[PDB]
Symmetry: C4
Subunit: 299 residues, 4 copies
């Protein structure tokens, strides 16, 4: 995998669709110097600073970062990245981790308000029905019960102690062996009710600009209105969960997954409970916003 | 009463309009095996599983169950069932009870969110003004203060210890000796205000597709706007409560009433307080949703 | 003052506009017998019972009560009543008091939900800035910050111990010596903002059907938008409060004022604090609803 | 600076745009006599009294006050006042301070509901990230996340003990050396999202009636939608904060700043924490409402 200014990029061991982007130690060192004056708390109060820290990182990569992130995330054949910075790999560096993740996100779009934290990101600690270790968290898309589309999901590993399992699960729609069967079903186009934990109605599948399937699915929030929709959804669920195309991805401390939420589903594998278990995560979810040469009216 | 695959059906001792459906021990055994992998908690999070457990039970009855439930519930001459499964008859089996009731409901429609429990069903324990033993709960219809129609009411007996009385009361509109007198009154068609414990306005009576009376009445939530509406409603109330057509139905542990809420009213008889009284109930309320050969437009 | 069936009516000592209606001991005795089966709690849950207890009282007065209440309350020259029943005059009889007040109100209209109690009436106990004894409560109309009109105000004295002062104050617009001066001012017709403790806009004065002034005024909830409206309202306030037409009315235990809120203002005089002071009140507020021979369309 | 009836007016030491208005001891004495009958609590309940106390003060200044306040606040070349009354200069006089500030505000407009206090003004005590002494509070305009425009900001110093720093910062748009550069940028006219701590959309700049720049900006509530808006806002922020036109104004106890919020920004300098620090402030924010000879339709 290739050499860019300030970082390297290589395919993952799980899939060529998922690429691993690592910022050099020198880029990392300089980034942290140049953003030291804004603590995370400044980023939380002034959203424009989220874009500024973005600019600082991209400028350190000779402006090669932003176009690469976008080309990868929007490329149907790929659409997923695992990102890290050499030197940021310990829980003591959580703030620095948030700054990094924030900078990358705000080069490609904007992170949405998170109702769990009341901020643009959320950090969660896991320590020893839905909260359950031996439970796989089923593959899904985020953002299914609001009108606005969530284009990206960012999941960062902040701490990991005494943890067995709990890999991120991923499925690219084009690796799913049953796509054609479910996409070509009439109920693939049936608007269904999705309800928060005001209701919205949208189909479970849609298409991208070129007519290729995309999904907006989660088992917990979809609300089949009758026996027809119900049985079909229970079959679709089994067809996703038993897929041979599912990826299992370890996310080491300091690294984060950044994926296109339209044609990747994500989930979490089970893990072993242990009295001294500690896992800390950070999430952001947002929309893409980027410049292209395209048409406009007026002056 | 007749033999179907997996269950038997017979008229009740109270009325030929109310039929008693009992699943055989073998059906019950197999149902519980085949649904063991989804605990009630799974059904609460993923509504499609509610329809799946429905399918499993109907499949065990050679697909004779679903059409029989619908034919009975929609039949004006009947419209009520008391349902049980041989082998499920103790409070220790409450989860199994919920699964059964859920499976039957989601063959005929879908159960609505219950604001008391925050789930698609609600379980309540009674132990020693509105909470009162010596108080009869007056005959009524459910769902009178929302715009959407509640088609069915399901009441299951989960536990019963040291209980005297407290039978379910039922009245089929066609057994009510004063129907003609109240239905033909001009105020039968007067939209009246109904208010939750946003207000809705609907008449106290309406008609089914064939022009036969249906009701949407409850004394607590109807809000007569003046002396005219008030006196008439107080007279209608007395005329319902003193009706000779009222049924009194014991609901033993493991059994549930499932009734058409348009032309049956329901209520509860008084019961004797006792220091060691324990009654546990489960309710679901929902709409009908079923396939028929009927017209549609477009392709 | 005159003799009707079941009650007597006479002018007050304060004004010929305020009439005193007293139910005979026999009417009272029979009313209480005939309504004993519905405790106040029944009236709170089933609003139609509020109209029924109305019917029972009017029937006991040979149907002379309802037309007299309406003729008095709607008569511009009067519009106020002080009502009592011989034999109901002690705090121990508070429930009976509520039943009586309820019966009278629901012969002339319907009492509105009271947000302080969550019921159709509210009972308040006073015992030892706004809560202040040496503070007169300024003359006002109720219902000024909702779109719907409040036609009547009912204030009943439930208990009174160790109380000096605290009479009800009343002003009939036609006894107000400054009416013409304020009514003919351009700001009398200026819609002004009124805001709850969504905002509404209405003028401080309006007219009845015959073009005679009515008011919708309270100093606490009117929200002058500028110096013009502000100064004028402060002058109007002084002109109401220093009026020579103000009535001061003692309301003995068991008695209640029932007034037309369009052309009477009400308030409360100061009272002496005392360690063993106890005053208990009940209020209802509502709209008029009554039959008359008038035009309608269709069949 | 000039002599008016009841007060004097002189330019500040910081700028000729900011004028210092001091009521004479005699005006002050008479004002306090003539408003003694309405405690602050009366002003809080009856908003018309806020305008009345205004009238009393202006009347004491031969009606020269109101026109001078308006001429100053609306004058583009000025638009800011520092106001005090000889004899009101101690925390023990806080109520008198509120009355004074209220009287002045309600000669020029009306103060809006303050959600922090639930009243038309708010008092705050400061004693020993956003709450931070060594933090400058950045220059901003108030009222940026509601549809209605806030025309004035009033900040009064009620108490000051053991305080180093914490001056009010001010910037008049016409003293800002980078105005032309940012105002002439296309994003100056881009409606941007502003969100409360329902969202509103307005540009960061607008124009007054003569086409001169005005601002509606605060770093905390503006929500850049993408990298373009974000970077530009971070640059605008630096350009405001490092401006050589910024004023630093000490506000002694008893004095208050009253500024035009359209073409002045305000903020606060850092201050030294001290164990026995006590600063008490009062704020009001409102709209202008005043008489002028202008056109109207109808009669
Ligand atoms: Fe997710
Ligand atoms: Fe019910
Ligand atoms: Fe009142
Ligand atoms: Fe401010």
């Amino acid at each position: 995998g290739q050499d860019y200014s300030g970082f390297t990029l290589t395919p993952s061991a799980q899939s060529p669709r998922l690429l691993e982007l690592t910022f050099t130690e020198q880029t990392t060192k300089q980034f942290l110097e140049q953003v030291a004056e804004w603590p995370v708390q400044a980023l939380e109060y002034k959203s424009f600073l989220r874009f500024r820290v973005g600019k600082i990182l991209d400028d350190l990569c000779a402006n090669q970062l932003q176009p690469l992130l976008l080309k990868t995330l929007l490329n149907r054949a790929e659409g997923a990245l695992l990102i890290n910075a050499v030197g940021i790999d310990d829980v003591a560096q959580a703030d620095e981790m948030v700054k990094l993740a924030t900078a990358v996100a705000h080069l490609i779009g904007r992170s949405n308000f998170d109702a769990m934290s009341g901020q643009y990101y959320a950090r969660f600690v896991v320590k020893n029905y839905l909260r359950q270790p031996h439970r796989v968290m089923e593959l899904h898309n985020d953002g299914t019960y609001v009108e606005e589309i969530t284009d990206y999901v960012l999941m960062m590993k902040i701490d990991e102690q005494n943890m067995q399992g709990g890999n991120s699960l991923l499925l690219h729609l084009d690796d799913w062996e049953h796509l054609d069967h479910y996409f070509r079903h009439p109920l693939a186009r049936r608007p269904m009710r999705f309800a928060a934990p005001k209701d919205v109605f949208h189909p479970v599948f849609d298409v991208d600009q070129q007519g290729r399937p995309v999904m907006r699915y989660i088992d917990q929030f979809v609300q089949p209105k009758d026996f027809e929709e119900g049985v079909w959804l229970s079959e679709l669920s089994d067809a996703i969960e038993t897929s041979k195309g599912i990826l299992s991805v370890p996310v080491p401390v300091g690294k984060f997954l950044l994926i296109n939420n339209l044609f990747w589903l994500h989930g979490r594998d089970r893990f072993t409970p242990h009295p001294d278990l500690r896992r800390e995560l950070m999430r952001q979810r947002g929309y893409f916003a980027y410049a292209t040469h395209h048409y406009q009216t007026h002056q």
